[PDB]
Amino acid sequence: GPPERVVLLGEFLHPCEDDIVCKCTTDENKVPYFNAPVYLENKEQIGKVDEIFGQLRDFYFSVKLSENMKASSFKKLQKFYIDPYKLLPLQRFLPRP
Amino acid sequence: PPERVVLLGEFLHPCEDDIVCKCTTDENKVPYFNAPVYLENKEQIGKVDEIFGQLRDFYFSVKLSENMKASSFKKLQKFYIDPYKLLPLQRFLP
Amino acid sequence: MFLQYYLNEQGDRVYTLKKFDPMGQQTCSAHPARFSPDDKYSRHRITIKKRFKVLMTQQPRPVL
Amino acid sequence: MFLQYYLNEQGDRVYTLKKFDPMGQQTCSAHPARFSPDDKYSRHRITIKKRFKVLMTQQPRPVL
Amino acid sequence: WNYSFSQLPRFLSGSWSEFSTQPENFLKGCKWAPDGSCILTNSADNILRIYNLPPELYHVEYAEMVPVLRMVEGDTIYDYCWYSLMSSAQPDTSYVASSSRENPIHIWDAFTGELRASFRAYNHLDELTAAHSLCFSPDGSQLFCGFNRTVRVFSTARPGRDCEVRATFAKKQGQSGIISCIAFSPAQPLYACGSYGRSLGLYAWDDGSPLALLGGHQGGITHLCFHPDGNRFFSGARKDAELLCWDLRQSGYPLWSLGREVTTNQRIYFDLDPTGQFLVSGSTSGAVSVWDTDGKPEPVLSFLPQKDCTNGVSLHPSLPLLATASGQRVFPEPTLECRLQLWWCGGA
Amino acid sequence: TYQELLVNQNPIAQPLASRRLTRKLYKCIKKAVKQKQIRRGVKEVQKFVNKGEKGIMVLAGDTLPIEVYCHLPVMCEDRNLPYVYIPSKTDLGAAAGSKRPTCVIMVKPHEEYQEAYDECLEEVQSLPLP
Amino acid sequence: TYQELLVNQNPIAQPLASRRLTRKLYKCIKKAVKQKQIRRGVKEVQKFVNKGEKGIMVLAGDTLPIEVYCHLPVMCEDRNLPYVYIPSKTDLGAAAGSKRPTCVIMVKPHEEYQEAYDECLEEVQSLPLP
Amino acid sequence: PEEDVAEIQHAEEFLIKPESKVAKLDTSQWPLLLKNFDKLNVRTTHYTPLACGSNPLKREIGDYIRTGFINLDKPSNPSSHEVVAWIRRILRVEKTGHSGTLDPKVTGCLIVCIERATRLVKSQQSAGKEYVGIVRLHNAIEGGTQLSRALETLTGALFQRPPLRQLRVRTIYESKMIEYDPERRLGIFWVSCEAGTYIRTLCVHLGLLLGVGGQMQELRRVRSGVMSEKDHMVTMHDVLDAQWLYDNHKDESYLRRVVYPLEKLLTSHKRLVMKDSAVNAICYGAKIMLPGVLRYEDGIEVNQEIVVITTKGEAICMAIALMTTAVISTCDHGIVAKIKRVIMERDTYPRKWGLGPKASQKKLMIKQGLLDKHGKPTDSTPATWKQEYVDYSE
Amino acid sequence: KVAKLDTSQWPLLLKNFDKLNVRTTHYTPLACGSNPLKREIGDYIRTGFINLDKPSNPSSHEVVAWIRRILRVEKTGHSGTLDPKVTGCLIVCIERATRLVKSQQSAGKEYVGIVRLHNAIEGGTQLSRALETLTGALFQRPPLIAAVKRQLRVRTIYESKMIEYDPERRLGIFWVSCEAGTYIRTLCVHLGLLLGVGGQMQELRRVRSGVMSEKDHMVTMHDVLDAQWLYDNHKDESYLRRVVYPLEKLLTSHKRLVMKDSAVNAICYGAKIMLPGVLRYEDGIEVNQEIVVITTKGEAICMAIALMTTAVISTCDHGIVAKIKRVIMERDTYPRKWGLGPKASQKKLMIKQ
RNA sequence: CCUGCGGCGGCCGCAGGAAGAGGAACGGAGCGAGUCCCGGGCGCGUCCCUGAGCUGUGGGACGUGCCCAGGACUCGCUCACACAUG
């Protein structure tokens, strides 16, 4: 079933081989699980998170589009949203304090 | 009306609507701010606004009365104040 | 601002009111550049300052 | 394989895709020759490497 | 109109001037669009070119053909094909598949000429492997492609990374080597695979289950064709003289053998009539030859489009035209320019 | 004077427009200001570079301290916007219309002068990498 | 061209064929390939020296790194086979009807070209030892 | 010849050989408070080091910032309070302070003390300073000779009113006129100041004494105590860039270029080196007594302010010397100094007071009742102890 | 002829020995050591390492196994796994040198690779800028998807550079300085994503492992085999001595502590590094820093963790200077001479007396 | 009585102390085992192959013999229990 609520995840950058690259915008620089679903503002699943790549503060991700979705659909700086329980804090990737 | 007066100092060159004056007060005592200043005739020229210079030979300036003009005053002219406003220098020194 | 400077041979600031040192080359503005707390452009400055070998790490270290 | 190289005047490696270096020489493959632990031609290699003064021992000693 | 070789085909203008831009260029073959609108040509400079039917045919010395698009690949193209169901009536269908060395299977739109989609295939080490052959299913729903001991099936509706894998060599038994070409039967669920390991295999479209595996050419098989008869199909190879005919009824052995000169490691294309009657083949000698398949196929004609290898031929699906492509690799000795051309093969 | 102007250049001021190209850029700026197509100053320039606007960004190599415009040339490269340095602050200011100096402007295309704008665009894009 | 190829040589490159002997060797290789009487590549040449097949062995003088083929001259000198270096591997590939290069070819004797073959053998053994 | 040299290296034998000569160090280029560390007068060498602290430069980047300060060049718009608030937010530290308040338009040297270094802020604020500023005369004058005469006349202990007030006294040590432009009447002066001197007031007094009247056009602080603009000075952009580089690349280097440890400020002061066992006692507030001392400098004088340091070169506290250097060398017992400002955090060094011979004897005698429960003598006290032991609390 | 040299020309860990700080200049030299270059050949190979140019076909594990069969030794370890097709610089540590392998595996790398882009881009500058974006501490996942789920982790790239771009073939040569454990295949994949065209790693070579680079002292597997052959057949050490270097060459960067001759075997048995044993010590010894403890002849005794700084060593007169991290030397290389000092003799006597 | 921290240049509150400053073997090393996060590659040898397919500095077929993820953390066995001799 669809999630209860969703939080801002990323802006739309260029497509890449029937797969879309997004700049990640999360408030505490929280980082998604792999294969976490990605939604529109409509809470409507466009795909899943495939790759995470970037500098740890300032990083990108890639989305494997859904069965019926298609990379031409999207527009620059379009926002995508994710179930908040799928995010991880940036602290978790920093070493043992 | 003034009770009694003693010396403040001696004339120096004027400033923007103001007179800058060399204080020669006995044992180098220091005036109050806003202290009315009188002539030898005991007529008030104005009041002290700035105190400056190094401690022993220090200077001061006067905000003149509307009746007076800085052009009137003269070299080696002396100015006066009631001694009950003068402050001992050792309040500042240590 | 009006305060300008040229360095000595000894390596320290000589302030002057002129736009050129006595040998004709431009005096620098004495004051630092304007800052605001919300610069997100630190990356850009670090990149360029690396490329031309002027990042502060690249200078030889001070005497301690 | 694609990586070629030639030497700089320091003796450092400059990596290229070009089969010729800018001064006209051929570039060398970056990768060493294929090896087998069952290789039996050690004698032959030592023999002509000595013959042409290019055995490793005949090179000047490395400073340590 | 019809196809009938009572006489030598008549020259209509081709393209020669382009290919000279690269020294020692040659054409790797040509294919008509499945509606007949245009012709696609590969070349040794790895640029897929495309020419329309010159309206001078409808509207004397023609103008030299110039292509409308140039789809540049970065490395050597192994295979390329038109979308199986392309039409001029429907704009979105008109696209070209392409496969190149260590690149994915690029899809190019045939009107605009941009890169439109990519299919990516990976080995067990998550490394990209290139496809040596391509084929669109006769219903248009799938894109079959060939690999070393493997056929992978992509779905045209979901371009990306997802494919069924169909092993053709299993615990050292089956069809070995690089699967070089794929074809489908007009009637039946069969599809047929040729290999550089000189062998054929028949498989079930829905399963991928082997139906037969057939005798060898004396060289690696490089092309296939099914007749408009679902019953009968043809095959050729590299550095073989013989071009073989097969039948699904009484299978197990090539019914006839046909002679052509192939002395290079080249895909020398051959093609049938859209009605199936004639079989036309190129050759390394340059001589294009024709057989009548309406018993053994009966020789009809040989002619020489140019004094160099004819490596690609194609027959227009509606209209009498023949197209030929030319060139071969020039070998040195340590110290003759190639072209696409068109021909009329109808009556006077 | 150009030889003397090369004395004043700051450490990061490359690629530096050659003398002919410097005069060409002054002329192009003087044409563009008349159509009100220039931006000027780091604040305006960076605001419209964020907004999405394009052009040729011309930079004064005289600028000290460098920190003011340092973020600009990478910000160009992120947007693929061309940029070039020229040997003075005062002449850049004069061409922009400012009687006081200026350290950055952005010359934008318009139909009147676009022949010269394309001269500048191609010559600047064909400058050597430092 | 022989001089330019001369620049490319290995340290072990001696004895190096004369320019005319180089042409003779190329044409002999051409004739032998037409007769299907060469072995080429280190793998084949090494194997068929092991099996004891006679011939002239022609080596590319520009092969780096040398350690791919440098064992071969001693393999010849053990058996007293003749051997010679030639200026380039690309020419050695070309003479064998190949567009790719190769670094060693062994030319076996056969009837048709044997007069030229015996001439090549005669000169190759005439070559000075380094 | 490296061919020759390398054949020698493999051929012939190398050894570090015995000698009878004296080993004399060279510590002249050890960092900060460890400079000329061998030239200190030595009391003893017998102690146990604890390996708990660090050399100030080589602190971990967390502790490096918390003990650190920045020699900042203040930008011209904000106030000093707002500047230190920015620096607090950039470095993500909890507390910050500065060496003196530059009113917003003024730029120059601002010693921004971070966290535990803020214990030094009072001593930095009291330090003598230097300024460069512009005086804008409202009327013309005979020339720069007169402005220089005015500056000479004001070079002294001075009366000053703050800008709008009470009268205050600040001394100006030395003044020179850098240059004067008769066209705009802008003159630039340099003055060395007692802390808290008002330069606006000085400019007004220069105007008054000349009679033309004048103001301060703009001002720059070129020196704040020990740090100068020549001396390791950093901009706000450097601070922000340093923290960003550290966050994104994990590169400590550029922060270590911008932030210095607080021990750099103390470098002028005389040193007094303590046993590691003494350190935490002094951090807790103990007296600085002679058994703790290992080293001490020349020219230590009574009531002089000294920096009390560990053997790793850290600063424990600022202190007031009670014994002269000669007295420290000769005496058997006593208090050598008393705390003025504890700099080091408590429990950086561990808790090792009351474990020594004399103190353990006293501690035992309390349990034996030979001293009162409060530690001072009784009739039960032996005559030897009651004679020999001098309680510093009397 | 040794007296002709500067101390800067002295080999390995004795280089610039006189610029160390001097605690004392007196000890009694024992006879039973050698300079690491002059070790007898068996001992030399047991302490040594090879700076290897790894071939293209085998895995690094296979390579080290072949080395330990070529040299007849029973233990080997390598600087860091190079994937089978990857060539370049692989430090191979032999026998006792295996004690340093964790230090080697932590050390920084440099790589030269080639990235193949799956579609055209504007030119080399795009690729260079995309390389700049991927410098710093980066998110990466190991390079196989076939295993269902793999953990994300952070790896740091210190520098990057683009050396060539070939627009015809869409091949670009990149040079990367990075920390160990960084996946370059994954870097090429992300670089392709960041350009938007796609990408693969075409080819890779490691040009540096820690302190050893491909520039100098690097040898081929052929050199290892041929050196062992020459030693076996002609009894000639010379060509092996150039193939294999002493492990002290790896430790050159570390800070040094020079011990009295009596202390050496005590340390080898597991004693802590006491201050009366110390002869010389280097500027910049810090608390908890990893340092090397050497003999007067230059032999590395152990890797030690410093419990004193340089100044603390200057001030004190006894106590623990350092504790052992890892002992390199073998027991009884030097004789037992502990328990004979003044204070220890006093303690012995008074326990008995 | 001393220090530290907060609040309006002294005072008030709260918190930490009451400190004479110990310890010239502390509590180690080396080796091995256990607990938590082989189907193939490679090497060699009965024949092909300058493929437009990587490729002759090597690719394939058929045979045939060497290689197998790192890091945390605990302790059994051997040797010492070491202040390093003017």
Domains and CATH numbers, chain I: 2-30+254-352 (2.30.130.10), 41-105+213-247 (3.30.2350.10), 108-209 (3.30.2350.10)
Identify the sign of the CA torsion I147, I149, I151, I156: positive
Nearest Cα residue in chain A from H244:
A57
| Burial track E11-47 (b if 16+ CB lie within 10 A, e otherwise) | ebebbbebbeeeeebbbbbbbbbbbbbbbbbbbbbbb
CB contact (8 A) between residue C54 and residue F11: yes
The C-alpha atoms of residue E25 and residue E35 are separated, in whole angstroms, by: 29
Cβ contacts (< 8 Å) between I9 and chain D: which residues? 63
Residue among H241, H177, H254 at smallest CA distance from H210: H177
The C-alpha atoms of residue E70 and residue E47 are separated, in whole angstroms, by: 6
The C-alpha atoms of residue C39 and residue F9 are separated, in whole angstroms, by: 26
The neighbours of chain E, by the rule of 3 or more Cβ pairs under 8 Å, are A, G, I
The C-alpha atoms of residue H265 and residue H125 are separated, in whole angstroms, by: 12
Distance from CA(H46) to C1'(J24), angstroms, rounded: 10
Q: Is the minimum distance from the CB of G36 to strand J below 7 Å?
A: no
Give the strand pairing for F56-60 and F83-86. parallel
Tokens at I345, concatenated: 């003799």
CB contact at 8 A, I7 and I300: no
Which class in CATH covers the domain with range E10-329+338-344?
A: mainly beta
G57 to D52, G92, G123, I104: CA distances (angstroms): 20, 12, 13, 46
Asked if the structure places residue C40 within a domain, the reply is no
Report which residue type is found at H82.
Answer: E
Asked if the structure places residue D40 within a domain, the reply is no
Q: Is the minimum distance from the CB of G71 to strand J below 7 Å?
A: no
CB count in 10 Å sphere of residue E216: 16
What are the residue ranges spanned by the domains of chain E? 10-329+338-344
CB contact at 8 A, E177 and E220: yes
Annotate G36-63 with DSSP letters as a single string.
T-EEESHHHHHHHHHTT---EEEEETT-
The C-alpha atoms of residue H87 and residue H95 are separated, in whole angstroms, by: 10
CA G14 to chain centre: 12
The C-alpha atoms of residue I103 and residue E240 are separated, in whole angstroms, by: 61
Identify the sign of the CA torsion H271, H276, H281, H283: positive
Tokens at I147, concatenated: 């295993």
Q: How many domains does one find in chain C?
A: 1
CB contact (8 A) between residue G99 and residue E331: yes
CB contact at 8 A, H38 and H27: yes
Helix/strand number for chain B, H first, E second: 0, 6
Cβ contacts (< 8 Å) between I200 and chain E: which residues? 102, 127-128
CB contact at 8 A, H319 and H272: yes
Give percent helix, percent strand, percent coil of chain F, each to the nearest 5. 50, 15, 40
CB contact (8 A) between residue A51 and residue I149: no
The C-alpha atoms of residue F3 and residue B63 are separated, in whole angstroms, by: 59
Residues 6+ apart with CB under 8 A from E296: E256
Q: Which nucleotides of J are covered by protein (CB under 7 A)?
A: 1-6, 16-26, 28-31, 41-45, 49-62, 66-71, 79-86
Tokens at C54, concatenated: 């002027």
Question: To which H or E segment does residue H251 belong?
Answer: none
Annotate I129-179 with DSSP letters as a single string.
HHHHHT-EEEEE--S--SSS----EEEEEEEEEEEEEETTTTEEEEEEEE-
User: Which of the residues of H are catalytic?
Assistant: 103
Residues 6+ apart with CB under 8 A from I332: I265, I268
CB contact (8 A) between residue H158 and residue B51: no
Cβ contacts (< 8 Å) between H248 and chain A: which residues? 55-58
> How is residue F125 annotated by DSSP?
H
CB contact at 8 A, H359 and H330: no
Give the residues after which the backbone of chain E is interrupted, taking a C-to-next-N distance over 2.5 angstroms as a break: 59, 294, 335
CB contact (8 A) between residue A54 and residue I192: no
Would you state the torsion angle of the CA atoms of residues H249, H254, H259, H260, taken in this order, to the nearest 10 degrees?
120
The strand order across the sheet containing E105-109 reads E77-82, E95-100, E105-109, E115-119
Report which residue type is found at F7.
Answer: V
> How is residue A1 annotated by DSSP?
-
First to last CA, chain E: 10
Residue among E122, E80, E111 at smallest CA distance from E97: E80
Report which residue type is found at I63.
Answer: V
| Burial track I206-230 (b if 16+ CB lie within 10 A, e otherwise) | bbbbbbbbbeebbbbbbbbbbbbbb
E81 to E53, E78, E96, E183, E313: CA distances (angstroms): 18, 11, 6, 12, 14
Residue among E175, E152, E137 at smallest CA distance from E105: E152
CA H340 to chain centre: 13
CB count in 10 Å sphere of residue I251: 20
The β-bridge partners of E322 are E315, E343
The β-bridge partners of I326 are I303
> How is residue E287 annotated by DSSP?
-
Q: Which of I18, I83, I232, I236 is catalytic?
A: I83
Any CB–CB contact under 8 A between H44 and chain C?
no
Tokens at F20, concatenated: 């002919």
Residue among F93, F4, F10, F11 at smallest CA distance from C24: F4
The C-alpha atoms of residue I8 and residue I22 are separated, in whole angstroms, by: 17
Tokens at E202, concatenated: 């028949």
The C-alpha atoms of residue E135 and residue D25 are separated, in whole angstroms, by: 46
Report which residue type is found at E23.
Answer: P
Strand, helix or coil for residue H71: strand
Tokens at I176, concatenated: 């990367």
- What region, left, alpha or beta, does residue A75 occupy, with left being phi > 0 and alpha being psi -120 to 50 degrees? beta
First to last CA, chain A: 38
D57 to D64, H7, I230, I238: CA distances (angstroms): 16, 12, 12, 7
Residue nearest to nucleotide J67 (CA to C1'): I62
Identify the sign of the CA torsion H111, H116, H120, H125: positive
Residues 283-302 of chain I with CB under 7 A from strand J are 302
* φ/ψ of residue E192, rounded to 5: -120, 135
Report which residue type is found at C37.
Answer: P
Residue among H308, H299, H303, H290 at smallest CA distance from H326: H299
Give the strand pairing for I273-274 and H335-342. unpaired
Nearest Cα residue in chain D from H10:
D61
CA-based radius of gyration for chain C:
15
Give the strand pairing for E221-226 and E232-237. antiparallel
Cβ contacts (< 8 Å) between H58 and chain I: which residues? 286
Give the strand pairing for B6-15 and B78-81. antiparallel
Distance from CA(I82) to C1'(J30), angstroms, rounded: 30
Question: Using CB atoms within 10 A of its CB, is residue D46 exposed (0-12), middle (13-18) or buried (19+)?
Answer: buried
Closest nucleotide to residue E330 (Cα to C1')?
Answer: J52
CB contact at 8 A, G84 and G59: yes
Cβ contacts (< 8 Å) between I229 and chain D: which residues? 42-43, 46
F128 to D14, F15, F18, F120, F123: CA distances (angstroms): 21, 7, 11, 15, 10
Annotate I76-115 with DSSP letters as a single string.
EEESSPPPTT-EEEEEEEEGGGGGGHHHHHHS-EEEEEEE
Tokens at H279, concatenated: 């350190």
CB count in 10 Å sphere of residue I148: 6
Residue among E133, E199, E195, E122 at smallest CA distance from E165: E122
CB contact at 8 A, I204 and D30: no
First to last CA, chain G: 24
Cβ contacts (< 8 Å) between H245 and chain A: which residues? none
Residue among I218, I196, I220 at smallest CA distance from I208: I218
The C-alpha atoms of residue H342 and residue H120 are separated, in whole angstroms, by: 9
The C-alpha atoms of residue H47 and residue H37 are separated, in whole angstroms, by: 17
Report which residue type is found at G54.
Answer: K
CA H3 to chain centre: 53
CB contact (8 A) between residue I114 and residue D13: no
Distance from CA(I139) to C1'(J35), angstroms, rounded: 30
Strand, helix or coil for residue H179: strand
Residue among E228, E227, E323, E325 at smallest CA distance from E267: E325
Question: Using CB atoms within 10 A of its CB, is residue I341 exposed (0-12), middle (13-18) or buried (19+)?
Answer: middle
CA G54 to chain centre: 13
Distance from CA(D35) to C1'(J44), angstroms, rounded: 12
Helix boundaries (H) for chain F: 2-5, 19-34, 42-51, 67-79, 89-96, 114-125
Nearest Cα residue in chain H from D59:
H3
The C-alpha atoms of residue F85 and residue H40 are separated, in whole angstroms, by: 57
Any CB–CB contact under 8 A between H252 and chain C?
no
C2 to C18, H133, H147, H186, H219: CA distances (angstroms): 8, 10, 18, 9, 10
Question: To which H or E segment does residue H150 belong?
Answer: helix H144-153
Residues 6+ apart with CB under 8 A from C40: none
Any CB–CB contact under 8 A between C19 and chain F?
no
* φ/ψ of residue I174, rounded to 5: -115, 145
Cβ contacts (< 8 Å) between H204 and chain B: which residues? 50, 52
Annotate G5-30 with DSSP letters as a single string.
HHHT--TT--SB--HHHHHHHHHHHH
Q: What is the resolution of this structure in A?
A: 3.1
Place of tokens 């034996």: H368
CATH code where residue D3 lies: 4.10.80.300
CA E20 to chain centre: 24
Residues 280-309 of chain H with CB under 7 A from strand J are 281-289, 291-292
Residues 6+ apart with CB under 8 A from H106: H74, H76, H218, H219, H220, H221
The C-alpha atoms of residue B43 and residue E153 are separated, in whole angstroms, by: 115
Report which residue type is found at F8.
Answer: N
Residues 80-119 of chain I with CB under 7 A from strand J are 81, 84, 99, 102, 105
The strand order across the sheet containing E150-155 reads E133-136, E142-147, E150-155, E163-167
Annotate H110-145 with DSSP letters as a single string.
EEEEEGGGGGGHHHHHTS-EEEEEEEEESS--S-HH
The β-bridge partners of A7 are A82
Distance from CA(I157) to C1'(J39), angstroms, rounded: 35
Tokens at E294, concatenated: 């309406």
Residues 6+ apart with CB under 8 A from F64: C26, C28, C29, F10
CB count in 10 Å sphere of residue H128: 15
Helix/strand number for chain F, H first, E second: 6, 4
Tokens at G44, concatenated: 């084949």
* φ/ψ of residue H100, rounded to 5: 165, 150
Q: Is the minimum distance from the CB of I307 to strand J below 7 Å?
A: no
CB contact at 8 A, E264 and E284: yes
Tokens at A3, concatenated: 């999630």
Report which residue type is found at E345.
Answer: C
State the residue range of the domain holding C14.
1-30
Report which residue type is found at E160.
Answer: G
3-state secondary structure labels for all residues of E210-275: EEEEECCCCCCEEEEEECCCCCEEEEEECCCCEEEEEECCCCCCCCEEEECCCCCCCCCCEEECCC
Question: Using CB atoms within 10 A of its CB, is residue E266 exposed (0-12), middle (13-18) or buried (19+)?
Answer: buried
* φ/ψ of residue I180, rounded to 5: -70, 145
Question: Using CB atoms within 10 A of its CB, is residue E281 exposed (0-12), middle (13-18) or buried (19+)?
Answer: buried
| Burial track I156-191 (b if 16+ CB lie within 10 A, e otherwise) | bbbebebbbbbeebbbbbbbbbbbbbbbbbbbbbbb
Q: Is the minimum distance from the CB of I68 to strand J below 7 Å?
A: no
The C-alpha atoms of residue H18 and residue I258 are separated, in whole angstroms, by: 13
Asked if the structure places residue C55 within a domain, the reply is no
The C-alpha atoms of residue G12 and residue E288 are separated, in whole angstroms, by: 52
Nearest Cα residue in chain D from I162:
D15
Asked if the structure places residue C56 within a domain, the reply is no
Distance from CA(E101) to C1'(J54), angstroms, rounded: 10
Q: Is the minimum distance from the CB of G89 to strand J below 7 Å?
A: yes
CB contact at 8 A, G38 and G106: yes
Residues 226-245 of chain I with CB under 7 A from strand J are none
Tokens at H238, concatenated: 């450097």
Maximum CA extent, chain D = 40
Would you state the torsion angle of the CA atoms of residues E192, E195, E197, E202, taken in this order, to the nearest 10 degrees?
-10
The C-alpha atoms of residue H264 and residue H67 are separated, in whole angstroms, by: 11
CB contact (8 A) between residue B13 and residue H211: yes
